[PDB]
Amino acid sequence: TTITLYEHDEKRYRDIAGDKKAIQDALIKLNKQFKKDFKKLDRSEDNSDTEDTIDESKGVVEVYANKIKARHYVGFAAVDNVFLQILPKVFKPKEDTWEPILAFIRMLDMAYGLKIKDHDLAYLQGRNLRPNLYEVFIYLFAKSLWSEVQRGYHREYVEVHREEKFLRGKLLMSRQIRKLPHQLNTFSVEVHELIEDNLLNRIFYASVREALRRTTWGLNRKLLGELMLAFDGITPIHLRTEHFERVHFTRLNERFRRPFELAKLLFMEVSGFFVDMNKLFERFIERVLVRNLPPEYKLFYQESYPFSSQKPDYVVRKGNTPVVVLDAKYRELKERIPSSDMLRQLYVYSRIWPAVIVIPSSSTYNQGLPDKPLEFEFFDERKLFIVAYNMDYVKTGAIFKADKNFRRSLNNII
Amino acid sequence: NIKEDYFRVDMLLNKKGQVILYGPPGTGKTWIARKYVVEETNEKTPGNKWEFITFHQSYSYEEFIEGFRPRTDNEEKIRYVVEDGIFKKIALRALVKGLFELEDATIGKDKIHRLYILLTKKEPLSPTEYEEYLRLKRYLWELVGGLPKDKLKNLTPKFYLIIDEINRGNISKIFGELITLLEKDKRLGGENQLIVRLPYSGEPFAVPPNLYIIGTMNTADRSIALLDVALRRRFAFIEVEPRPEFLEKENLKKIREKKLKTEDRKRLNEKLNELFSKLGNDNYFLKTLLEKINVRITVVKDRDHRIGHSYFLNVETVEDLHHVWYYEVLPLLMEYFYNDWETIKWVLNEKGKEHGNVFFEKLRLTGPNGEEAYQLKVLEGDAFIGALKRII
Amino acid sequence: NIKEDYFRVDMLLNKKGQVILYGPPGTGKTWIARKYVVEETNEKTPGNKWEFITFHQSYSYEEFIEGFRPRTDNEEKIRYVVEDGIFKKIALRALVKGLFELEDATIGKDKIHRLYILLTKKEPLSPTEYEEYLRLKRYLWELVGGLPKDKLKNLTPKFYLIIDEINRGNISKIFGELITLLEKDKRLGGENQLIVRLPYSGEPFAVPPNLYIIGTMNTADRSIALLDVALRRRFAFIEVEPRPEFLEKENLKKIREKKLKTEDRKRLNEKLNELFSKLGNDNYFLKTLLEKINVRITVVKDRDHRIGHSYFLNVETVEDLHHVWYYEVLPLLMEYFYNDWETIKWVLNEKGKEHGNVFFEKLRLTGPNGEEAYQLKVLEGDAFIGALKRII
Amino acid sequence: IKEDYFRVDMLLNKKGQVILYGPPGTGKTWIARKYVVEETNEKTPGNKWEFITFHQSYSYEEFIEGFRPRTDNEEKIRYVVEDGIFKKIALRALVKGLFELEDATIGKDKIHRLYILLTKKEPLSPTEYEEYLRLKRYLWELVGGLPKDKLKNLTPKFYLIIDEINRGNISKIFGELITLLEKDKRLGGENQLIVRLPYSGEPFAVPPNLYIIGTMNTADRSIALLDVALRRRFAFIEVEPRPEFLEKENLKKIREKKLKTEDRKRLNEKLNELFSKLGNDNYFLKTLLEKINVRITVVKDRDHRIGHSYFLNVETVEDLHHVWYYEVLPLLMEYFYNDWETIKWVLNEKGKEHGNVFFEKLRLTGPNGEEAYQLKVLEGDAFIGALKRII
Amino acid sequence: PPNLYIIGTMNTADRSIALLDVALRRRFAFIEVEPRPEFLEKENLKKIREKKLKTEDRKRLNEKLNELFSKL
Amino acid sequence: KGKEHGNVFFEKLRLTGPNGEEAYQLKVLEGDAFIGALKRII
Amino acid sequence: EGFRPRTDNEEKIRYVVEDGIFKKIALRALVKGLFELEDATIGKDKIHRLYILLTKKEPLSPTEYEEYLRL
Amino acid sequence: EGFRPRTDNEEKIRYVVEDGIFKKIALRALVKGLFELEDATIGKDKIHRLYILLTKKEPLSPTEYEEYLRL
Amino acid sequence: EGFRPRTDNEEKIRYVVEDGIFKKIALRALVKGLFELEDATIGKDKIHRLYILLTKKEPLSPTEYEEYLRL
Ligand SMILES: Nc1nc2c(ncn2[C@@H]2O[C@H](COP(=O)(O)OP(=O)(O)OP(O)(O)=S)[C@@H](O)[C@H]2O)c(=O)[nH]1
Ligand SMILES: Nc1nc2c(ncn2[C@@H]2O[C@H](COP(=O)(O)OP(=O)(O)OP(O)(O)=S)[C@@H](O)[C@H]2O)c(=O)[nH]1
Ligand SMILES: Nc1nc2c(ncn2[C@@H]2O[C@H](COP(=O)(O)OP(=O)(O)O)[C@@H](O)[C@H]2O)c(=O)[nH]1
Ligand SMILES: [Mg+2]
Ligand SMILES: [Mg+2]
Ligand SMILES: [Mg+2]
Q: Do residues D255 and D319 touch, judged by C-beta distance below 8 A?
């Protein structure tokens, strides 16, 4: 069964496909698996409460008696033929669930640091496939591999001190001089032969073999079927985490960086990955600000310690003199005013940095939308200047029209 | 319609110089290449005018052109004389056999005929005549460089070389000196005559315009990720399609009677009439079965993974069709789809069927995470024919 | 011929010392390396003035400049001697031929002539004269140590080493010592005369300024491409783009009658007039056909996987264009886009077409999970030109 | 000028063996060849210094010692162990250092007999090779009975200037030398090591004369000296690609160093004609290499920078055109193979698509919305206007 | 010669039949020797062990197998 | 980590990459300014 | 088929080509099959000499090995 | 087993087949097994001679190596 | 321990077995160990003859290696 969630959204167990007992068995393994692998991913003002909440089967999904509720952890996971995918709530609409997939991967393209191509994703737009995050990241792995295997096969050179019936390469002399004449019929050479089954090819044969076994499309089954035939002579391996560390990216296999990072993102039971929606917006806004703020340079994660260090998500300073704090919040900001938890942190970030502070918030049809300019000016009775900026999201499309509107509102703010 | 396939090879082999009969296995690519050379140069065996040679994964350049090899010398201790491979024993042979018919006033025809004897010698070279072989080979490449390009295009004996399974070996490593030479222009006598200096023996070497290197590439193994520049431009690729037109009643009768004898063709007529009467009196059954199963292969997987037509070409009864479907089609079908079951039953259009007359029946015990494993099921008699009559 | 690709090789090889003609397959890279050296040295065969070798993955460092190679003597069969490769037999040949017209070798001009005989000797070196060869070699590097740099700047011959497919071998390993000699001011006579010490023989070695190295690498493959940044400085890369301008009506008559200067110029001209008259009297058809494929390959594939102008150069008739399409470049296009059918339909500009006069017909049978693949169609006649007029 | 010369001379007395590492295209082999020539007054290799260079087939058996068949009699091929390139230097640098000592090494007839059999270019006959192998056993019986004060100060400085030290498998080539390449583990040091060789079994120790100045490139990161125990031995001199030499005056000072005022007047008016076409600015090629090396530092790494061996041999604007389109733009395209919006940014033509751009945009597009550019060969003064926009 | 038949034997716990070399899945013809549990009955285990032993060993083999399956 | 200019071994290059990357360069110091860049480690 | 060393009456090592397993069973299947052929009776004495030599073990001297290579 | 040179005559260095450890221990187990067997009494006075040659803790002498070969 | 060819002045290549670094320390520690005590190590001149033939700087002659193998 395929189940899909948006951030802070619920599904009924009666309407859902499959079995009632089957889905709740899949989740308790996933929330437990998120507990052991929680510390690998960074957060930003998450209020995670690592001791109590995550180990109570509330790590990724809150499984309840009457419904199934998603926390603010975005991504996907495939467990026990119950494929779960959690999209952001910002891309929620009012092919009907194919626009938020390419919106989320493009927000996973710019924020998280991936180097995927837009024409890789635009190939899938309109082919009426079943929307699934695991079916597209296997495709993004398989297409970027088959576009990097079609040119060259990555045959890397190792040297072997082999006793050959012929003579290839440099003849070892200290091993041939001390050769008895009863065994003179084989040369003892040290040939730098190119092997096809290197460590990077043992991984990509194993990463395809664990992908074709767990794929469900008709496009990925054809593409991984051609990749497995190209890797036919390679002896297979069992994938571990030691194999993904033992290879290093030099200049002669640098073009295999794009399929390998996606092969490390999906393989290392469980499959997939999860990230916090607060930090992914904190990373995504950081791409927008430094591009859109020419007058003043901006650094993310600068920290100033009170008295326990409370650090802004981003601060922009021209040289050192202007202190314009920019704290990225994923909150909906209901009733056109910041909440108690938000404005209390905005007060501290301005005071310990005469410092204006701007809060960027999400804006679409689903999320709360303010007017086009800088919506809310606030003073906290200390000559402060709190500006509520809102970035519109044309990221569901491929054109960046809202970046010009975000620059025009920031130019009036700067 | 096989003389056009002996003309499709023949029109490309005088224009590009060498071909590759690429196609799915069980088609006749080895048989078309072998029965074209035997029909052209009337020599039923290898050796003199053509040499059959297959490739493998551990085949190296030193076995093909030349390499240092230990060789015994008159039942005594070994020496380390450099041995010419299987190509250089026929590339030099195609030169010195063509240089008989050339009437020039500089040919050492007594010396060239002595070199031709030492090249066709089936025994290995003894050191009393190996130095006579290397000295006469030195006279050959002093003579070839002195002949003009006008007298090195019309060499009469067409030498051949059936490279079987050319994609199985590493093609760019075997053809070391033969991905700069195997063009029609880079041969001897052409406009771009190149005599390439070899690394091991140190003597210059150039392919003559007689040698045509026919290749028979299986493409269900070590697929189309080829060299794509060197081993793809030189070879004029001929697709040998798996033709189900040879699987009718008359076409199976015509194939198995021409190679047959007097008493064999009457028994092959009685056997094939018994076979197709058990199938439903369908004279076009095995054609329609192979054509239907080939369309399902080219839709799901690649178009060059189709089941060929050399398998069903040697059937005479239902029991022989059973032993070619369960040992040369269904193990071959489970090889292409990498032990998949939900798409291997759509090829037989048995996607929504289980436990009946199906070639892959579902086991009635699912796994822990809801997975299911199918199992091959042997059939017999009219149950198997009813399992074949719903593939169409 | 002398306009661009000759006058920019000769200017750049005389300035840098080494030229690599990198470019996609089907372009005149081996040809412009062969034509430039033969038109310079006036020797249409290898040997004395120039040597044409080619690299591969079985090529050794020990067989290039210096290595231990076991020879076959008479009474001691296994005798391990150090044998100079092909580069040390062309670098020492370029040195002792250039040192015939010097004025500081006045004690051993007979010794330099005797050393030149031992290097031009194609017979294998007997061990009674190999020590005479080694005594003259260590006399040579004593003589260039006492030679001034003003007299080693101008050596009047011009020796060449056309290595072909340089990028195939392990170029960091084959050029062992040559990764610090191959520069214009690091040969003999340059501003930094470097005489390095070879490992095996223990004799010093330095590339003369007489020598030039014209590599022709291929850049369609990527796992063998030359990314050694310390080696790309030594060479001087010349991109030979595949020019479709050699496929016009006036250009095919000028390229094919320059080489074939026989009395068949009336035969080629009336055949090339008949070929383009069947193409709609379009004198720029094959120029437009190769241009509208190479641009459409550049945008989706890499820019170095383009179709060269050596496929469509040897066309004569529509029957010959049909043979070079369906058997050389259409299996090549199915190798670039291997079961990526929406791309290969678009490269031939048949994206919306799925029936009729088209190369790839759509199958009328879709798959289980919504996949769909196409099928070749062997066209002929004016319908084939109607399938080529849609590309341009 | 003499700063890189003196910096090599300081570290070759402190650590013992210097390594000039840097991006390819700078003066690494040149400042290593000019150092050894100006310090030993010997322009060709020989006794006082020997140039070698490493590769993957430069194994241990031919560098220090290994078995080598050698008979010099055309009969009775004697399978004897012969010393490599290094041990023929370190034994030569020792027995040349045992001349100037007064009375510590009492071998004044037996050391000079060993030196004349070590510098002998003709290969050793077996009637004198038994003398060479017997005197070498006397040498390591002599060394060991000398005080460290009469062994630390050996006068004549020997140099084994090697090249591409990273290119060979350096932990395999350096065998017994992996523990002897410190300044205090040599002969005469505080902790001398008479280490034993495997094959011949005769002991061995490096003299304090022999300095190993070894140049390497660090753009190939596939083969860089990452062994952390062969970075303690060597002293790593940074040789960055310095664009200060590509001025008008600094290019006139370098290129007119050895011409004897014959072609120097031709070179002076040729550089006057080059910079008159670049815009009458003496500082063009300095900031051209600077704005490329900075823009290639922030993208690829610090180590893939364009050197100054490319642009140093330009004379006219035509020779700059033939070093741009044929040496560095094919180099810039193979850093970024089919990575087009990056290589457009190194030339900072990122908004520029058509016109005087090196990479014009193809008028076609893709089926999935992709695009790719095409290299545009520019000529004339339009090439300089396409080049001055980089600065 | 056409006499020489090549009867292979393949322990496929480590290497599957799809993981062979490509000139082994087409030149040869594969027979799956399935693990038959029907050789482990009470009467089938007696008949298999009756071929190797003698007559007096068979009554001891009969009594031991009767002692085995009574405990199970 | 916060020092990007002045007495520091690695100055920051003034421009960033096209997609948010930024590299440094090894600044050679001398004298007491080197010690002032060394005593801030401890 | 391969190379294998062999002593010649306590002398230096003499290399000789000794057939492996597959060639010793393929040649044995040939010379045993030519007994019951009516056309191969032109050399029935010499073929039978080969079959006795091909089933015995350790050919000790070259006088029967050169007989073996002649047959 | 493999080939080793021996201390034969001066100009007559010979390559014999000196047995290793596994052949020597399996022969020694076979010789000691047949030494106490009842039906192998045809040459039991020579099997004890072969046992002394196999427990000989030194390289075998060339004047009696053929006695080891014949036994 | 390994094999090593050794042609001295005019003899043939007699393939001697040369002890490596470790056995020339292990035998040298054992022989210098037994040289100081006297419980049952008879032949103190014989043990001293083995110690001289272990600290030889020159390679061993075949008239001296054979007595070194016996000791
Ligand atoms: N006359 C003439 N012929 C040309 C020209 N360019 C290519 N050709 C022809 O192309 C043919 C082969 O081109 P070639 O140079 O050999 O490709 P290549 O460099 O070897 O291709 P690769 O596989 O190594 S990558 C030759 O027959 C030659 O006649 C040209 O500019 N003029
Ligand atoms: N006068 C002068 N010439 C220089 C200087 N730097 C480089 N050159 C010149 O540039 C040329 C190339 O420099 P070179 O030393 O050979 O580069 P490299 O470091 O050795 O190149 P690599 O492949 O080993 S990494 C030399 O001929 C040298 O004359 C310099 O600072 N002063
Ligand atoms: N008579 C006849 N037999 C054919 C034809 N095509 C194939 N065969 C048969 O196919 C068999 C050879 O198959 P082969 O070429 O080895 O298949 P492949 O090499 O794996 O592609 C032979 O036994 C032929 O009898 C044909 O056109 N006519
Ligand atoms: Mg075949
Ligand atoms: Mg070529
Ligand atoms: Mg260098």
A: no
Residue C237 is encoded by which pair of tokens? 């890369």
- Ligand 3 nearest-atom number relative to CA B310: 10
Range E13-21 contact pairs with CB under 8 angstroms and sequence separation of 24 or more: E16/B339, E17/B331, E17/B335, E18/B334, E18/B335, E18/B338, E18/B339, E19/A236, E21/B57
State the DSSP code for B280.
Answer: T
Coil, strand, or helix at residue D66? Answer: strand
- For ligand 2, atom 2, which residue shows the shortest CA distance? D254
Among residues C137, C120, C133, C146, the alpha carbon closest in space to that of C202 is found at C137
Report helix, strand or coil for D236.
Answer: strand
String of DSSP letters for I1-46: -EEEEE--SSS--EEEEEP-TTHHHHHHHHHHHHTT--SS---HHH
**C77 and B77 in contact (C-beta within 8 Å)?**
yes
Q: How was this structure determined?
A: cryo-EM
Interface contact H46, partner G, CB < 8 A? no
In the 8-state DSSP scheme, what is residue A332? -
Residue B202: name the closest of C69, C228, I60 by CA.
C69
Give the position of tokens 């041995």: B83
DSSP code per residue over A378-410:
E--SSS--EEEEEEE--TTSS---HHHHHHHHH
Residue of the nearest CA to atom 9 in ligand 3? B310
CA separation for the pair D33, C271 (Å, rounded): 64
Backbone angles phi, psi at B79, to 5 degrees: -115, 180
CB A298 within 8 A of CB A326: yes
Taking contacts as CB-CB distances below 8 angstroms, the residues of chain B near G14 are: 75-77
- The secondary structure element, H or E, covering residue G31 is helix G22-33
Instruction: Give the separation between CA G15 and CA F34, rounded to whole angstroms.
Output: 73
- Token duo for residue B175: 């053809």
Instruction: Specify whether the CB–CB gap between E4 and G29 falls below 8 A.
Output: yes
CB atoms within 10 A of CB C156: 9
Q: How many helices (H) and strands (E) does chain B have?
A: 15, 13
The residues that bridge with A86 in the sheet, in sequence order, are A5, A75
The reply to whether C371 touches chain A by the CB within 8 Å rule is yes
Please give the distance, rounded to the nearest whole angstrom, from the Cα atom of residue C216 to the centre of ligand 5: 6
- B374 phi and psi, to 5 degrees? -95, 165
**Ligand 2 pocket mutation, candidates D309, D314, D331, criterion most atoms within 8 A of CB:** D309
Q: Which chains sit next to I, with 3 or more Cβ pairs under 8 A?
A: A, D, H
Q: Do D79 and A177 touch (CB under 8 A)?
A: yes
A301 — alpha (psi -120 to 50), left (phi > 0) or beta?
A: left
Question: How many Å lie between the centroid of ligand 6 and the Cα of residue D164?
Answer: 6
Cα E37–chain centre separation: 10
Helix H, strand E, coil C: the string for chain C is CCCCCCHHHHHHHHHHCEEECCECCCCCCHHHHHHHHHHHHCCCCCCCCEEEEECCCCCCCCCCCEEEEEECCCCCCCEEEEEECCCHHHHHHHHHHHCCCCCCCCCCHHHHHHHHHHHHCCCCCCHHHHHHHHHHHHHHHHHCCCCCCCCCCCCCCCEEEEEECHHHCCHHHHCCHHHCCCCCCCCCCCCCCCCEECCCCCCEECCCCCEEEEEECECCCCCCCCCCHHHHCCCCECCCCCCHHHHCHHHHHHHHHHHCCCCCHHHHHHHHHHHHHHCCCCCCHHHHHHHHHHHHHHCCCCCCCCCCCCCHHHCCCHHHHHHHHHHHHHHHHHHHCCCCHHHHHHHCCCCCCCCCCCCEEECCCCCCCCCCCEEECCCCCHHHHHHHCCCC
CA-proximal residue: ligand 3, atom 23 (nearest): B310
H helix count then E strand count, chain D: 14, 11
Query: Is A226 in contact with B305 (CB distance < 8 Å)?
Result: no
